[PDB]
């Protein structure tokens, strides 16, 4: 039977469950966000001290590489908490009527935002064509760094190449990157903040898309 | 696009308002009745509330008149307003020609009045069906009056978001001339089959008149009889 | 965004909302109705519903009074409504002037009502296409009121979901003064003619009128004949 | 978005609802008049119909009084009504001063009616035009009565979609007091130059007066002569 | 969006729908008129139309009385609306003190009633301008009256498309006390110099009185000789 | 996009408008009342306010005749407006009958003038619920007018922010025919449970009535009592 | 004759036809989801666990390829799955009219989000053009993965090149698609439920786009 | 003469002309779309099973090219057929006027609709750039084949490359491509059978754009 | 003086000038079109009846140059012949006012359409970024062809290439293309058809924007 089947799922995907993630980002997720903010905000540094040559361009810089890992780790797991809150909403959208969806639009707006925070929690290099605030690094973070520091490796290594800058820039992939990751990460923070607040504000429509006691009034 | 106003027509020429508003009616518990040798009957179903209700106002059958009574479906508040014309207009209609003669003008009072609300702008339909059953001077009575305005006498129908399912049964299940008790029961079981798998019709009400009697309102012992 | 007020040209002059509820009677069944020799007749299609609706609340043939009756096609509820008020109508002309002398100023007054609220905002014509016949000073009579109050005499016509096929019948085999039975048949092939393949024709109510006589209504068994 | 309110100027001072109104005039058939020596005469086209039709009814001119008379143009709804209020005003206007005295302010009753209907929201002026005609005592009297209450006092002129072609014609064709049969023609004439290719001219309507006489429909034998 | 409504004054602090209907006067014909030694004068600009058309109600100029009469210009519809009401106003002034003693109070009555349609919703202003002139108690006469209700006693002033130009001229060239045939031609160039080259101003009616003399139309042929 | 007007049914057929006012109701203060032996009494929470606010005007609960008081909950502008009716109303039902005989039309009054409201443009509803509770002909009474117009007789029951939570206790714990003081405190219970943690119900305002005496309002020493 | 036609086309797409996909999508389709989660889930942790040299891009890691491939797979099933439910509502769009609508809405607001998932069921490589949320890999997961491996291994196998990164960027893509795979069914399940959820929630209008029992208000 | 030529053209595009489209899609058409749906639902599974070496990629799989075709073909016939009904259409679309267009939208969506069939009856490569569901293959299936095929062909014939996915890279544009053929002919199926639909729910107003006795009302 | 300049104008491209293209596009124009249709949908077969070897990439198809040509100039044709009446309504846009424009609309979208026309006309490579239909190859087709082609060529003659699709990519090309001739062609005739009514049912008020007798109302 029908009915069982939509109960069956809500179940499942209660609202609790959906309030835990809520919890553990006001929580665990925000200290590991500020963490890996301090982790690059000092690699970064750690790196700006330093003169470029032959040699930083022979082996990959390891503390950096940690430290984009935790991001893109941390994102992933950001991403899922995010998706459970979403199947909490998504699978309590009332019938689609034209009336009294003055709750609905709850749902929508703390969708939307969702969105928001997971799209900005998935990577994505450097498209150029979007002409909204360019995505954060984000998820492919990891990636995207060793594809543009691999190509001036090659030019650097091989005969190797005498440009001078071309040495620079390698310097400036390894920092321009750190920075990238606080820059995200303080972003993040922004971004969970708000969307705990939404929530936390919200919950009682988002469940209860709309009360009805219409044995009061029709009978 | 159309659905906004009481006076404006659709291009297929539908008053969606209006229509609206019998879906009003629609969101109202079941409740039918018909007449038999004799006398008509009418029964109502009431989803038990609140035992800090006085019973005696939560009644969906109302006695307009010792010969006549009606029962509504759909706003509560359009329910008790339409109710008082009822009674009301019974009354000038027994006070101009001596006595209630056809029970059928009161019924028009109603329809007339509840229809003009369904063709000037500034006001509302209401939302609000009723069953009206009684004896005049012809004898036993049953018309049901719509929110539209729209009356048509039967001899046995019914209001309610049961309604298609009631008449549905009775429209092949239904015999005239029944003796009382055995058309209350065919009712009763019509009635039942309307509700949805699981629920148990609890205590309706029912009421009764013959050919010169008085109406009688079956007190919840004799009606937890055919049960 | 024309078709919002019944107060409102178009850029090509149309009233729109006038025009939407002349669809609203294009909803309702076929009717029709001709003169021939020494009075007239009327043929209303009735798709037989639940046997629960007593019969003599369903007959769209309406006797206004001795000598004249009507049948609309519409909105069920402004169907009644003009109806009354052609019955009613009828008397004050009957009183004024001792005797309904021209049907005419009957359907005048009906026409006069109707079209009004076809040119106040406030207001929503009525859904409602009437045809009167019946035997005047003058003798036999045919008018067909339609929402916009517009009123034309006929020898026959029709209203309904069919008028357009039952005249383009009519209007290629229609024959004066036949002998009321003959006439009876040819109206009740043109209507036949009206329905969609596979539909059989039910039983559908008919009544005439001859000079010197009131009318009278074909009981389903005189009807049953021309089957 | 300011053809919307019968009430509302545009911005180079137009009201485009009343203009719509003239349009709905302009989807009417053809029909003009002139005065002549002693008297005047009135054309109307009509393309002929159903058969099932009363011809008494389909007459675009109207005697208002047996002195005056009037054709229309436009919503046949308004087109009775106003007609109405014409024989109406008629009377009033004859009893108040024994006799209608100047077909004048028969026409004004008319046009300040007309015009009130396209000041005020809430209403809609009439989609008709009315080409007034008769003897007075001043003599032959043409007027032509448009949607907005404007009227003007001609010796020929014409309403309906051919109007501009009618009236091309006669502006430079039309020599008053011409002997009734030869005005008649000429009429004849102009009407047919505003048909389109292909079509024929059938059998139009006529009427006319002569001081000291009152008006006569010409017989559709008499008018098959002009043809 | 606020130019929609009657009653809706914009952030300037403007009513653009009495502007716009100040406009609808802007499309009317050209008129003026110029009090002298011992009364006032009109001149109206009408460029000939039909043949078909009786000249006798084709004048922008009318006698409201003997000694006083008045020219439009704008809608023709609103334009014999209030002439009437001028005629009118005039008689009741004209019975309730003996006499129209004073020619201001009769456009007094006339700039208060079209006020009055540029202060309520639900109404429209009359598209029309009056220019009023004539011989009171007090002497030569001119008033013009615009469509908001606002009048102003001129020496000289005029009406319609040209206005402008014409006022342009009279104020630079117009001095008082002229000989009535010399403040007539004097208006005639005046006049002229409103229109666009190639135009050829065709006869304009024209009218005059003089204290203690009624007014006076000058005849198509003493109007032909100012050519 | 329907919630705009009191008069327009949305799609499912409900007056989101009217219901919005229920809505109103809730945000005021809760309050109940309940029969017993012989009597009624009533009960308001007040969340005591500025001492600059003389008592004697901020009770929740008013005598609208010395054996009849109400109660009301939500704006409170409306709160005054509504009770003046009441007391109004009891008045002239005083007079016409000699004596506020049944409650119930005191209270009938009230609810076709809030229904009213609800069915008509240009009005909003009032966004008030009242508890009426006395003693007439019959005994104890206890309604509970919504902004709807809907009455019912209880013999316990609430209004506010609480009523759900109140109700729910009662509709579970309340048992008739208590005495006075074990019926005061049920209540207070009752009442107490609907606050939310941390809240200490403060003192609230009390008044009851017993066949054959008046009302009698608990003063604030008699109520620290059962705190 | 005509009628007959419409007729025989919603005949053999009934609602049962369409209410099935449904039940299989609560059912058997959802665990084989959430199993090639689990096996991604893990077959990630399988790389991220190793260090890359010349042999890792000699052969293709097979264990990756049939992850992605019951991915493809997967995703190509709930498409048609989905087209079916769509040509269910399709066939019973009634004429177009411009009142009464109220049904219809409801058949299109239960496409447009059919839309969305098999939009996001079928793959689509970094376009770099959108601003919406990028599609998750989807069908053409398996092109793409091989494409953007493939170009890493001629760069390392042939000489072969020294850049330490283009190493560990081959690294990256084995990994990086592993998690692309999790997140983009962790995304499907969110969506399958909502669509099951909106469904079984319209079903009563999808079919019945308006009823009709005229004969009550106009006769 | 006017008039004429615009009957003219009406006459030789008649209701029974894409009328006659609309049956041949409700027969025939559809029969052969599922055809070439089992065709390469079966030649794909024909591939999946197997093994590539640099011998595959010195011959063209005919058998695919074969589904191929047969879809373009296809395709290229459902557009000119979708065509017909287009210009029967828009031949009938009345003079612009502001009111009494009631019907003239119905041509409108009618159209819009055949143009979402021939937009995906047409193809269109990868393109990247709109954000709405990509375009099915369509068309120009046959052509972006072997434009991918011969590409990963020089790579691996000519020395050639030692890249082992560049090798299974081959492997999956024959097989990607043959269910890239029955996704989008399950989709037509779909697309067609609501125009279908459609047409026949509104041809008597699609060719009666308003009708007009106007002899009634006025005179 | 001015007046007498808007004249001068307006003259020169009267009605009968624009109303004689609409005449040559019903005769004379229509044939070439279907003549060209005719022409490809043959020489397309012409091509697809063949195997291809070396030498095909030798020499330019010359039969296909001549199918392409004719379109390439029937486009053309119909292009100005379009402008043509472009100017003939552009030279008699009113007064720009806020009212009376009832006619003004009729010229935009008799306008509207002719671009439609005239732009499926034009040619344009497969820019890759519409999200509307692709535009018919049209105009510049004839270009397109050779340089899609000549890079095949090159690829093939220079040694020369193995790749046996880059064959049969060439063979594509001749008959793809020949294709997209009868396919763009098919389309115009549905475009000119449609504007041949468009305009025969308009042109009335095409060159009268708005009626004027303004002397009745206004005096």
Redesign the interface.
């Given at each position: 039977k029908?009915?069982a089947?939509?109960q069956?799922?809500?179940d499942s995907?209660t609202e609790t469950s959906s309030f835990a993630v809520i919890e553990e980002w006001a929580a665990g997720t925000l200290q590991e966000i500020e963490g890996i903010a301090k982790a690059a905000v000092e690699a970064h540094a750690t790196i700006r001290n330093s003169t470029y040559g032959r040699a930083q361009a022979?082996?990959?810089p390891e503390q950096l590489?940690g430290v984009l890992q935790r991001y893109q780790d941390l994102c992933?797991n950001v991403?899922?908490q995010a998706?459970t809150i979403?199947?909490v909403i998504?699978?309590?959208?009332?019938?689609?009527?034209?009336?009294?969806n003055l709750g609905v639009a709850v749902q929508h707006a703390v969708l939307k935002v969702i969105?928001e925070l997971?799209?900005k929690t998935?990577g994505?290099?450097e498209?150029?064509?979007?002409?909204?605030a360019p995505t954060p690094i984000g998820?492919?973070a990891?990636?995207e760094?060793?594809?543009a520091?691999?190509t001036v490796?090659?030019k650097l290594?091989?005969g190797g190449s005498q440009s001078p800058s071309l040495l620079l820039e390698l310097r400036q992939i390894d920092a321009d990157f750190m920075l990238k990751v606080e820059l995200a990460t303080t972003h993040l923070s922004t971004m969970v903040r708000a969307v705990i607040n939404a929530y936390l504000l919200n919950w009682k429509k988002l469940i209860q898309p709309r009360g009805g006691h219409?044995?009061?009034?029709?009978? | 696009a159309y659905d906004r106003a009481i006076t404006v027509f659709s291009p297929d020429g539908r008053l969606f308002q209006v229509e609206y508003a019998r879906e009003a009616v629609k969101k109202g518990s079941t409740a039918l009745g018909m007449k038999f040798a004799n006398g008509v009957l009418l029964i109502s179903d009431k989803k038990v509330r609140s035992r800090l209700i006085e019973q005696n106002s939560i009644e969906k059958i109302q006695l307009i008149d010792d010969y006549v009574a009606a029962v509504t479906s759909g706003l509560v508040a359009d329910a008790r307003v339409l109710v008082d014309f009822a009674r009301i207009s019974a009354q000038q209609e027994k006070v101009t020609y001596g006595s209630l003669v056809n029970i059928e003008n009161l019924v028009k009072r109603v329809a007339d009045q509840m229809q003009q609300y369904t063709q000037y702008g500034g006001v509302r339909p209401y939302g609000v069906s009723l069953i009206f059953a009684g004896i005049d001077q012809i004898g036993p009575r049953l018309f049901d009056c719509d929110p539209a305005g729209t009356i048509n006498e039967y001899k046995a129908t019914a209001i309610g978001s049961g309604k298609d399912a009631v008449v549905s049964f009775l429209e092949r299940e239904y015999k005239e001339n029944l003796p009382e008790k055995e058309a209350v029961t065919l009712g009763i079981k019509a009635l039942k089959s309307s509700l949805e798998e699981g629920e148990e019709l609890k205590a309706p009400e029912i009421a009764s008149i013959t050919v010169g009697n008085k109406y009688r309102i079956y007190d919840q012992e004799e009606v937890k009889k055919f049960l």
């Open positions: 029908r009915a089947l939509i069956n799922l809500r995907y022979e082996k990959s590489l992933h991403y899922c998706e979403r199947t998504a699978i309590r959208i009332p019938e689609h009527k034209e009336a009294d969105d997971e799209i998935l994505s290099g498209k150029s064509g979007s002409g909204g998820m492919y990891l990636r760094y060793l594809s520091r691999s490796e090659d290594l091989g219409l044995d009061v009034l029709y009978r | -």
